[PDB]
């Protein structure tokens, strides 16, 4: 359990005093829960962490109850940004961040859009930030925005793949963190400009 806090994701904007409906379970956007994701929905998840079986736009997607297209942060293109995750129950696993470089609030984000910009960690270590220790609190991740990419209505997607289930690793082996895991996604509305 945790949420993208800086910039604030859609279901957490109430915490900062925005006029968006509150979600007191904003730490629980776990794709409808593990069994719903993996037993009901074939491993699929909404773009923004909702149960995949809900119709689009889902509650945390643009046009859903929490998706009012209110920009919560403005960044310079190509800059290093520092994002904060509030981790309430610190399940082992890793985080990834994707940018849908959308320019119109009336079109809907898709995973294909997000997948065009998988964000690199500023430290050069790749695309996955690993939370190695079970410690609740605020985790900061420094990310490099892609050079030359600007967007007036961007969506930032945080993905958390937990690692607390044992499964077939596919190499003849099984292991902790192999196979399907509980997953979280959160979306935040941001803008990126040359400035
Ligand atoms: Cu949790």
Residue numbers in the entry: 1 to 195
Original authors' sentences:
Here, we report the investigation into the digestive enzymes from T. domestica, which we show include members of an uncharacterized family of endogenous LPMOs. Phylogenetic analysis reveals that this family is widespread across Phyla not previously known to possess LPMOs, including algae, oomycetes, and complex animals, and is active on both cellulose and chitin. The high statistical significance of the new HMM, and the lack of significant hits against HMMs of previously characterized LPMO families, allow us to rigorously define a new family, which will appear as AA15 in the CAZy database. Our in depth phylogenetic, structural, and biochemical characterization strongly suggest that AA15 LPMOs are a key part of this ancestral mechanism and help explain why T. domestica is one of the most efficient cellulose degraders in the animal world.
The Dali server was used to compare the fold more widely with other structures in the Protein Data Bank (PDB)19 revealing that TdAA15A most closely resembles bacterial AA10 LPMOs with the best structural match being the Serratia marcescens AA10, CBP212, 20. His1 and His91 directly coordinate the essential copper cofactor with a T-shaped geometry as observed for all copper bound LPMOs characterized to date.
